[PDB]
Amino acid sequence: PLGLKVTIVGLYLAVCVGGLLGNCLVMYVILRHTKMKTATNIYIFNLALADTLVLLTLPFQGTDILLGFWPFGNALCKTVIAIDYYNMFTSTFTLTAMSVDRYVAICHPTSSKAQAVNVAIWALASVVGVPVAIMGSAQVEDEEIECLVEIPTPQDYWGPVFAICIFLFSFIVPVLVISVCYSLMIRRLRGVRLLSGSREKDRNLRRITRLVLVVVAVFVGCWTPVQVFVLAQGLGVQPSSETAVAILRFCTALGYVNSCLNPILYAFLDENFKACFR
Amino acid sequence: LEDNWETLNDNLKVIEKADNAAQVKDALTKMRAAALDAQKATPPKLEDKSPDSPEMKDFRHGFDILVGQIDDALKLANEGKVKEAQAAAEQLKTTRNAYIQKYLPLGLKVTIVGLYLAVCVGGLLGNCLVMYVILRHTKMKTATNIYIFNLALADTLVLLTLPFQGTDILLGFWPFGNALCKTVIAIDYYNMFTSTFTLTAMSVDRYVAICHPIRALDVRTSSKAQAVNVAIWALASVVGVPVAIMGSAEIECLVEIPTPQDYWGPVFAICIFLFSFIVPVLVISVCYSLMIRRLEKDRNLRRITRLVLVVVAVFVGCWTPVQVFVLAQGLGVQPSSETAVAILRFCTALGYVNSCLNPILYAFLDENFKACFRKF
Ligand SMILES: O=C(NCCCN1CCC2(CC1)OCc1ccccc12)[C@H]1CCCN1Cc1ccccc1
Ligand SMILES: O=C(NCCCN1CCC2(CC1)OCc1ccccc12)[C@H]1CCCN1Cc1ccccc1
Ligand SMILES: CCCCCCCC/C=C\CCCCCCCC(=O)O
């Protein structure tokens, strides 16, 4: 309703301000402040960059929720939709990369290469990003103009097709790989007390590995409700009650909250980052 | 006690290996003090019994008779008859195997295995029969039946493992190696997750039919239900494959918890509990609850809805005891009595009985299925 969406928007504004502050701060620290351009941080940079982009759209999406329509035209409609998908894909793919990086460190004890991967990650993402941007538009159909992605005819076929594919390749499979990485660490680590190197430097590996795992946990936690719902919507399951809509609005919000959460996680679970703040 | 037990073995083998009376008299000494420090201890098997219960009292008695022979063996050694003191060691090894060993059944596990064999045969027959009927026999590929197909498929896989698990129970170890160990563990988890997730999907499907009778026709196409099954096996693998990797194989088939176990134990224990069982069931509850408030031949809708609910009920009924126990095991609560183990073995069995139950439910509560089973 009128007051419950004000809640949603106020929530966005909060996420927006804190998010940009946090992520921009992170990007700065890694970029110029210090030579802490490590494999993991270059991937973290990639996450912050993505979060930044999507955070910039909350002000726009926020007004659409209030007005009940899209008053920014087509150009910005396509722009927003692209980012939204770019966000999801670059996030998971980057997390996966970070996970493999971790596993390599643990079992096989450069930033340039991590930088290369980020490129490949944005290259893969665009395979869905650009296409969706083209398909997306703001179409005054009946009653109201609105921003959305157009599903080809018949929708009863392509709906499920894109619904399933995007579910698997944007979320499940990446998460699946991530699981394998950590599972393999587990079997490797067993029997490794202060082993595989020297005491002084091991805690970092453990601490940096612990970091990557929490970020993944937190991400998966924030975007799973939305992923399933969106999946269901693709199959034709549509919400038609105030409560249904509300829950959806909040789970969509809950996902966007993930963007501003990362910086705080780095602050609490990463010594180096914890130092550059205060 | 497991410590003292080995302190007795090494000092029992040092005896008849010795070439000096001093090594014997010394070994018998070490061996004696251990029998006393082990007589006071308590075996795991009887950590739930009183210090004066027959089972417990007759465990400290085994250590009396034993110690008595170690005292005797020492008199021979002191009297100078050192050679026939070694002879007394072969006499001890006997006392060790008969009285105290068992404290570290045959016919009740035969029951368990025979139970598996029964569930296995009937299960496969029932489910395979179901998959056939839906697959080829008829164009009864409805949204609900495509989900039922998914359940049967899962039941089929897990049913195939009962023959294998059944022998492990008999032999008391896993004789099939690692490859099959990993394979079996995966299925077992795949089963649990695929089952609940499918039931949830079926429940939502039902709710949609009840509340959206207009848009359900286009929505509850089998093609879409087919797509869901794919997503269900995709979600399941997020735990299935990882567990397969962690799983491996006296020697036994089990999943390895990372160090420290006192932390990760509860972590996986709680997460698997919530996401494999509770949350799915929670959603299901919402679906029916919403039907309640909302509520030609709608008899089908009612009958098909009634069906889904019974299948859920029966499933939850069969897997709740195990879910809680397994949850408790994750928190460190371990069974250490014959009764404890037995109850666990049967509750684990009870779960596997659920696999063969479904086909019968369809036969009794579904007209269409009830008709084709008459054919065969
Ligand atoms: O709907 C809107 N916002 C919410 C978008 C939420 N997104 C949906 C897409 C997202 C991530 C979360 O869903 C799961 C998933 C898996 C893989 C990639 C991307 C996704 C409308 C109304 C307001 C502005 N407008 C933006 C928009 C329009 C059409 C399509 C997307 C966004
Ligand atoms: O232990 C065994 N069988 C019983 C397996 C019972 N499982 C335990 C796990 C299960 C499902 C039921 O319970 C809770 C739960 C929550 C979520 C998913 C799956 C589960 C051993 C002994 C001999 C055969 N062998 C098979 C096996 C070994 C290790 C792991 C699984 C199976
Ligand atoms: C979260 C920040 C909230 C900002 C509130 C936005 C206020 C918008 C008020 C009036 C906009 C009306 C737009 C009508 C234009 C319709 C035609 C068109 O958009 O091309």
From Swiss-Prot, chain A:
Annotated S-S bridges: 77-147
GO biological process: adenylate cyclase-inhibiting G protein-coupled receptor signaling pathway; calcium-mediated signaling; neuron-neuron synaptic transmission; neuropeptide signaling pathway; phospholipase C-activating G protein-coupled receptor signaling pathway; sensory perception; sensory perception of pain
Entry's transmembrane regions: 3-28, 42-63, 79-100, 113-135, 159-183, 212-232, 248-269
Predominant cellular place of this UniProt entry's protein: membrane
UniProt topological domain (Cytoplasmic) ranges: 29-41, 101-112, 184-211
Keyword Mitochondrion annotated: no
Outcome recorded upon mutating residue 84 to A: Abolishes G protein-mediated inhibition of adenylate cyclase. Abolishes antagonist-mediated inhibition of G protein-mediated signaling
Tissue: Detected in blood leukocytes.
Extracellular side, ranges: 64-78, 136-158, 233-247
Domain of life: Eukaryota
Localization in the cell: Cell membrane; Cytoplasmic vesicle
Keywords recorded for this protein, A-Z: Behavior, Cell membrane, Cytoplasmic vesicle, Disulfide bond, G-protein coupled receptor, Glycoprotein, Lipoprotein, Membrane, Palmitate, Phosphoprotein, Receptor, Transducer, Transmembrane, Transmembrane helix
Swiss-Prot/TrEMBL induction comment: By phytohemagglutinin (PHA).
Residues annotated as site: Important for G protein-mediated signaling: 64, 84
Keyword match Disulfide bond: yes
Membrane topology, from the record: Multi-pass membrane protein
GO molecular function, one term: neuropeptide binding
GO cellular component: cytoplasmic vesicle; neuron projection; plasma membrane; synaptic membrane
Function summary: G-protein coupled opioid receptor that functions as a receptor for the endogenous neuropeptide nociceptin. Ligand binding causes a conformation change that triggers signaling via guanine nucleotide-binding proteins (G proteins) and modulates the activity of down-stream effectors. Signaling via G proteins mediates inhibition of adenylate cyclase activity and calcium channel activity. Arrestins modulate signaling via G proteins and mediate the activation of alternative signaling pathways that lead to the activation of MAP kinases.
Family: Belongs to the G-protein coupled receptor 1 family.
Protein name according to UniProt: Nociceptin receptor
Taxonomic source organism: Homo sapiens
Swiss-Prot record, chain B:
Membrane association type: Multi-pass membrane protein
Assigned keywords, A-Z: Behavior, Cell membrane, Cytoplasmic vesicle, Disulfide bond, G-protein coupled receptor, Glycoprotein, Lipoprotein, Membrane, Palmitate, Phosphoprotein, Receptor, Transducer, Transmembrane, Transmembrane helix
Keyword Glycoprotein recorded: yes
TM segment ranges: 107-132, 146-167, 183-204, 224-246, 265-289, 308-328, 344-365
Reported tissue expression: Detected in blood leukocytes.
The protein's name in its UniProt record: Nociceptin receptor
A single GO molecular function term of this UniProt record: G protein-coupled receptor activity
Purpose: G-protein coupled opioid receptor that functions as a receptor for the endogenous neuropeptide nociceptin. Ligand binding causes a conformation change that triggers signaling via guanine nucleotide-binding proteins (G proteins) and modulates the activity of down-stream effectors. Signaling via G proteins mediates inhibition of adenylate cyclase activity and calcium channel activity. Arrestins modulate signaling via G proteins and mediate the activation of alternative signaling pathways that lead to the activation of MAP kinases.
Induction: By phytohemagglutinin (PHA).
SS bonds (residue pairs): 181-253
Classification of source organism: Eukaryota, Metazoa, Chordata, Craniata, Vertebrata
Site (Important for G protein-mediated signaling): 168, 188
Residue ranges, Extracellular side: 168-182, 247-264, 329-343
Keyword Chloroplast among record annotations: no
Residue window of the full protein shown: 47 to 333 of 370
Cytoplasmic topological domain residue ranges: 133-145, 205-223, 290-307
Domain of life: Eukaryota
GO CC, alphabetical: cytoplasmic vesicle; neuron projection; plasma membrane; synaptic membrane
Protein family per UniProt: Belongs to the G-protein coupled receptor 1 family.
